[PDB]
Ligand binder design. Structure first.
Ligand SMILES: CC(=O)N[C@@H]1[C@@H](O)[C@H](O)[C@@H](CO[C@@H]2O[C@@H](C)[C@@H](O)[C@@H](O)[C@@H]2O)O[C@H]1O
Length: 294
């Protein structure tokens, strides 16, 4: 409610009140910003991480690996400081593929070596921590390696570390996945990719995790419309009948959730089926913060 009705970037006491709102109890908003769509990567992009709304809690840096070096330069030198100025946490996202890479030894030394290499992706940018994207089951060997790496990371990130840095588990699977059963003690937040899902199915999914967390750790995810992407239908008009909107309102029975996140926050407000790149004032993000914290 100390948040702007447009997308101003407040400067003094207007900003301080937003800095205090964020230290206060609230349902948090998170956004995956696709790095290859940042104006500092390639050409033809319309949106910068500098445009992210002041009332955002976490920005994920989600690369695909063909971003131009200019992106990483701007992230370290410009973007991270300005987002930290707005009290926005910046977190690097990486796929589970990275933690089960067989180029790294499946041994204590190997789990530590790999954790060191992922920790460079955090420390070299002054980031607030690391997000691991899990969308697959693992064999015994993969499970063993991923668990080892989570356990090595847990020394520097998340609840076991005492650093204040985040260790995030984001997934489209449930709390029965063996990796989850191995690593839940290491986790800051768990984010459920819930694109195009039943409002009626939400409780069932939460219940699969609720024994391993408090409800403030749990966030649910909708997607914005990706240019040439899957039509999940999470952002239909009118807004206040959207799946995203109903996600902002949903609470598990007898408890309050952590909040929600968007995939492709860089696509906030682009109509479903509009495959061109546009700018955004982050209307949906800002509305959806209001919807969770009225
Ligand atoms: C093969 C393919 O297209 N895979 C995509 C993933 O690339 C994408 O991240 C994922 C995102 O949506 C999540 O997973 C799906 C299966 C479903 O459970 C959604 O509700 C989740 O949000 O979509 C895959 O289909």
């Amino acid at each position: 409610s100390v948040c702007p009705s447009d997308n101003t970037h407040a400067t003094g006491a207007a900003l301080q009140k937003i800095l205090d709102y964020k230290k206060g109890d609230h349902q948090i908003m998170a956004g995956y910003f696709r790095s290859w769509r940042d104006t500092a990567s390639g050409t033809g992009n319309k949106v910068s991480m500098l445009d992210l709304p002041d009332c955002l809690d976490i920005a994920f840096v989600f690369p695909e690996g063909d971003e131009t070096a200019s992106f990483w330069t701007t992230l370290k030198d410009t973007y991270v400081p300005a987002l930290h100025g707005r009290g926005i946490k910046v977190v690097r996202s990486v796929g589970i593929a990275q933690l089960i890479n067989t180029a790294w030894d499946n041994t204590p030394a190997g789990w530590q070596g790999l954790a060191d290499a992922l920790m460079k992706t955090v420390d070299d940018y002054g980031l607030d921590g690391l997000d691991i994207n899990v969308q697959q089951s693992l064999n015994a060997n993969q499970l063993k390696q991923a668990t080892g790496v989570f356990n090595a990371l847990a020394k520097k990130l998340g609840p076991k570390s005492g650093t204040g840095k985040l260790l995030i588990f984001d997934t489209n699977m449930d709390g029965t996945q063996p990796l989850w059963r191995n690593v839940y003690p290491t986790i800051s937040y768990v984010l459920i990719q819930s694109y195009g899902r039943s409002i009626s199915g939400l409780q069932t999914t939460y219940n699969s995790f609720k024994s391993y967390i408090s409800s403030k750790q749990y966030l649910i995810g909708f997607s914005f419309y990706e240019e040439n992407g899957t039509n999940w239908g999470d952002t239909t008009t009118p807004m206040t009948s959207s799946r995203a909107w109903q996600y902002a309102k949903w609470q598990p029975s007898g408890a309050t959730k952590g909040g929600i996140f968007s995939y492709a926050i860089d696509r906030d407000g682009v109509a479903i089926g509009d495959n061109t790149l546009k700018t955004t004032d982050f209307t949906w993000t800002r509305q959806l913060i209001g919807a969770m914290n009225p």
